[PDB]
Amino acid sequence: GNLWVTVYYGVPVWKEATTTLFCASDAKAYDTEVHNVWATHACVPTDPSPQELVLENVTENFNMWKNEMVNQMHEDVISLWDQSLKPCVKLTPLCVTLECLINCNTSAITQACPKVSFEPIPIHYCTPAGYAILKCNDKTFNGTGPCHNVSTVQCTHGIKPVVSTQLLLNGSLAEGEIIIRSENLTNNVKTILVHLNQSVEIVCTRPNNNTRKSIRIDIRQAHCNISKWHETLKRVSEKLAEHFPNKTINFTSSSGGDLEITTHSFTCRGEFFYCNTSGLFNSTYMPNGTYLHSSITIPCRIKQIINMWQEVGRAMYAPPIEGNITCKSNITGLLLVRDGGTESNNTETNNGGGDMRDNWRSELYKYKVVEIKPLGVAPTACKRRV
């Protein structure tokens, strides 16, 4: 016959929004470790009732680059880092519009800079009311793909606060296997990301061993006796080939520049360990790798005058501690883009990452924040008296 409308309440329909979310973060509120200091001051001890009420046959495109929840975590972290980390003398730049003399005059900013500590907190993200944080048990997606056997949460899972480049420390791991994240193969900047389904050992020790500080008118010299690993890189290459089929697989070019994009740059003693492109960056893949063959060696050392991943401009940290440091880790994956172009003939090379908005997005492809739209419309044969 004819068709008429109904509308009703509460019928889980969670269209998009990406608003503020609150943390769930069990600090100690006692340890001087600034991680927990922030995790309690501006963050809150944990939520004990998360209910992953698993989805049925959803089809939702957990597009991992339209999730401003990730930007929100980003800005939360940038908020964390600065009362966390104390730059002695920050030389940040500025100009005020004057068409070409835009007054880019170096703004020096002095402060006080002692040490505290560094130890991540798996924080979690918590939708506001009427909002639901869709998760994803599938992780593949090609980058953009749903998940059958996941659903909502109340607060999220642990997403820690350490930052590093192409390779993390003390951080997440990968759930099922190694998958990748990108799109079109015409020009290919489109940074690719892998989550590596095993762990790896990275450990740097330096008790004193170098009492003599300078060389001329070494303590900053750090030797990272690590491991050996390689087979995870074989899984690396086999994946790469599964997406780069007919070509071999190199890296072949770490051009350089600002140290933080190329070198393994990771946070320990508040500072980082900066070496060249000599290590583990080399092998080619036609059906074999190209390297060789406990804590043996790899030479990544510390600097002091760093750049910020946060806002452009330098920073000037403190002289280090006498020695006896160590940091372990559990690599979740890696950060890579083809060193591509059009000069190339049938060898293929991947090459590097320094944008956090993905550095903490190999952990949030699942999380899609939504409101509720619990008012719903549908057809019936419902109409009133005349």
Partner 1 sequence: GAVFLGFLGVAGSTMGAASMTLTVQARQLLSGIQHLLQLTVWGIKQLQTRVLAIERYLKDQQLLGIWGCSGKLICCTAVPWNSSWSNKSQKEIWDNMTWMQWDKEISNYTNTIYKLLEDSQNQQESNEKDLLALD
Partner 2 sequence: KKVVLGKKGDTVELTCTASQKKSIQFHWKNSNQIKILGNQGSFLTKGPSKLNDRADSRRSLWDQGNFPLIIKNLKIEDSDTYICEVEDQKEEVQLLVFGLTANSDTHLLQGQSLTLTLESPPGSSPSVQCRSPRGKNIQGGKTLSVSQLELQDSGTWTCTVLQNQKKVEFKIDIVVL
Ligand X SMILES: *[C@@H]1O[C@H](CO)[C@@H](O)[C@H](O)[C@H]1NC(C)=O
186 binds partner 2 (CB under 8 A): yes
Does position 41 interact with partner 1 (CB under 8 A)? The reply is: yes
Please name every residue paired with 133 in a beta bridge, in sequence order, or none if there are none: 369
- Other beta carbons less than 10 A from residue 361's beta carbon: 21
Question: How far is CA 164 from its chain centroid?
Answer: 7
Which partner from the list ligand X, partner 2, partner 1, none does 246 bind, CB cut-off 5 to 8 Å by kind? ligand X
Least Cβ distance, residue 239 to partner 2 (angstroms): 19
Do residues 301 and 290 touch, judged by C-beta distance below 8 A? no
CA atoms within 13 A on the CB side of 270: 25
Q: Burial, 51: exposed, middle or buried (Cβ in 10 Å; 0-12, 13-18, 19+)?
A: exposed
Roughly how many angstroms between the first and final C-alpha of the chain, as a whole number?
A: 19
Tell me if 59 contacts partner 2 by CB under 8 A. no
In angstroms, what is the minimal distance from the CB of 32 to partner 1? 15
Rounded distance between C-alpha atoms, residue 209 and residue 221, angstroms: 10
Q: Is 294 in the site for partner 2 (CB under 8 A)?
A: no
Q: Give CA–CA dist 205/224, Å, rounded.
A: 6
245 binds, among partner 1, partner 2, ligand X, none (CB under 5 to 8 A by kind): ligand X
- Interacting positions 108-127 with partner 1 (CB under 8 A): 127
Nearer to partner 2, 145 or 320 (CB): 145
Nearer to ligand X, 276 or 380 (CB): 380
Applying CB under 8 A, among 153, 202, 261, 327 the residue interacting with partner 1 is: 153
CA distance 349 to 251: 4
The answer for residues whose C-beta is within 8 angstroms of residue 349's C-beta and 6 or more apart is: 249, 250, 251, 252, 253, 338, 339, 340
d(CA 169, CA 119): 10
Number of neighbours of residue 353 by Cβ within 10 angstroms: 21
**59 near ligand X (CB under 6 A):** no
Does residue 152 belong to the site contacting partner 1 (CB under 8 A)?
yes
Binder of partner 1 out of 14, 273, 281, 365 (CB under 8 A): 14
CA–CA distance, 55 with 48 (Å, rounded to integer): 21
Going by the DSSP 8-state scheme, the letter that residue 233 receives in this structure is H
> 225 by DSSP, 3-state: which?
coil
Q: Interface mask (CB under 8 A) for partner 1, residues 126-145, using x and -?
A: -xxxxxxxx-----------
Q: Is 56 in the site for ligand X (CB under 6 A)?
A: yes
Given partner 1, partner 2, ligand X, none, residue 319, with its beta carbon under 5 to 8 Å by kind, binds none
Instruction: Report residue 128 as tokens.
Output: 């506001």
Q: What does the per-residue mask of binding to partner 2 show for 112-151, with x meaning CB under 8 A?
A: ------------------------------x-x-------
Q: In whole angstroms, how close is the CB of 185 to partner 2 at the nearest point?
A: 7
Three-class secondary structure of residue 70 per DSSP: helix
Size of the site for partner 2 (CB under 8 A): 17
Taking the complex as a whole, how short is the minimal distance between the CB of residue 292 and partner 1, in angstroms? 49
Any contact of residue 245 with ligand X (CB under 6 A)?
yes
Q: How many whole angstroms separate alpha carbon 312 and alpha carbon 349?
A: 29
Q: Which does 189 bind (CB under 5 to 8 A by kind): partner 2, partner 1, ligand X, none?
A: partner 2
Q: Which does 29 bind (CB under 5 to 8 A by kind): partner 1, partner 2, ligand X, none?
A: partner 1
Binding site for ligand X (CB under 6 A): 56-57, 245-246
Binding site for partner 1 (CB under 8 A): 2-15, 17, 19, 22, 29, 40-42, 44-45, 51, 53-60, 127-134, 148, 150-154, 370-380, 382-386
